Structure 1
Amino acid sequence: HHAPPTLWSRVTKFGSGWGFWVSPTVFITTTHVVPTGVKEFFGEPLSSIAIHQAGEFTQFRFSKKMRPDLTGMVLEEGCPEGTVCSVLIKRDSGELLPLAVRMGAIASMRIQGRLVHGQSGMLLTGANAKGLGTIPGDCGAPYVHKRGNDWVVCGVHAAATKSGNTVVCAVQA
């Protein structure tokens, strides 16, 4: 299942990583990539943004439509165990590098002393090109899967082992 161009157009450079437009007003990312001490995000003052973050998942809901080109899509708290997700990793050049992952259990974990409310997954060696998810710049990339004719987003990239074989997305409680 190939994420279509419009779905990739939601993936946006943010802080030290990426985030994702769920709708014209809702942007999600991983908390540790969010810049701090700033007065605005995407030009909008803090006073016009409703922030909801917990467990390394950050959601911003802007008061104004920031990406009216987008439809609203479903954001879920993780996905059923065994779901194959695509992690929509972009690189700075604009190259698209989707990573296929088989999802495991949703749980609360501590990672580098940070509480991560997340879902573990395993990289699918057999569905990915050899030689992703293992550099700081990849955090915040969305985990998506296709349900019927619709794509669902269910987490943001938060952690991975040194090898990248085991990953964790933060999920919204």
Structure 2
Amino acid sequence: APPTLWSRVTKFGSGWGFWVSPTVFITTTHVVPTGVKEFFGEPLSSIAIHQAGEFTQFRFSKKMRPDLTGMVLEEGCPEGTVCSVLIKRDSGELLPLAVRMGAIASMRIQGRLVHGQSGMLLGTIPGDCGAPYVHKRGNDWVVCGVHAAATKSGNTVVCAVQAGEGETALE
């Protein structure tokens, strides 16, 4: 993972967010500041906000990170593949966690049913919410979720995904 990729990982509210491009920022809904009128110094009327369950996307009118190129945002992580949760700790330490992704479905997070995807850690803390789930496709990195939750057991984590509707079916 290149430094640029990590530079997209940004402290935000009670957790983290991720610059997908110069104008697009994704994060986990429950970490988003609630009493505010600006994000990153931009008034809400300047920002297109799409929230689906625990997945929140901001598109700013202004180029917030013109140093960045856009990258692909997938609708969920590829089931069965190893992704990395790009965790930054408060000391500055980089803690990428490898995770084997499982099924996409509805899960109860923060007392609400939301589209999510479980994964097995190959640990995280509450402050890690918003950290991106990414994987490499070709020579490029792709982002597919943002950290939402974990079992007390610790071994399983859940990311919120942009669109999970009907990804797994009863047989």
TM-score, length of structure 1 as denominator length: 0.91
| Residue 38 (structure 1) aligns with | 36
Report deviation, 1:116: 2.2
Where 2:127 maps in the other structure, the secondary structure is helix
Alignment RMSD, CA only? 0.9
Query: What is the deviation of 1:39?
Result: 0.5
Q: Is the 8 A contact 1:56 1:115 kept in 2?
A: no
Q: Is the 8 Å Cα contact of residues 16 and 129 (structure 2) preserved in structure 1?
A: yes
Post-superposition CA distance 1:69-109 (Å, at most 9, x none)? 10100000112211100000001222100000000001111
Q: CA deviation at 1:160?
A: 0.3
TM-score, with length taken from structure 2: 0.92
Task: Give the whole-Å Cα distance in 1 for the aligned partners of 2:78 and 2:88.
Answer: 25
144-153 or 111-120: bigger deviation: 111-120
Runs of 4+ in 1 over 4 A off after TM superposition: none
Q: Give the equivalent residue in structure 1 for 2:100.
A: 102
Bigger Cα displacement from structure 2, 110-119 vs 17-26: 110-119
Q: Which structure 1 residue ranges, 5 or more long, are not aligned?
A: 125-132
Note the C-alpha offset of 1:114: 1.8
CA distance in 1, matches of 2:78, 2:8: 23
Deviation at 1:164, TM superposition (A): 1.9
**Cα distance in 2 for residues equivalent to 1:170 and 1:83:** 16
Identity of aligned residues (%): 100
Q: Which runs of 5+ in 2 are unaligned?
A: 163-171
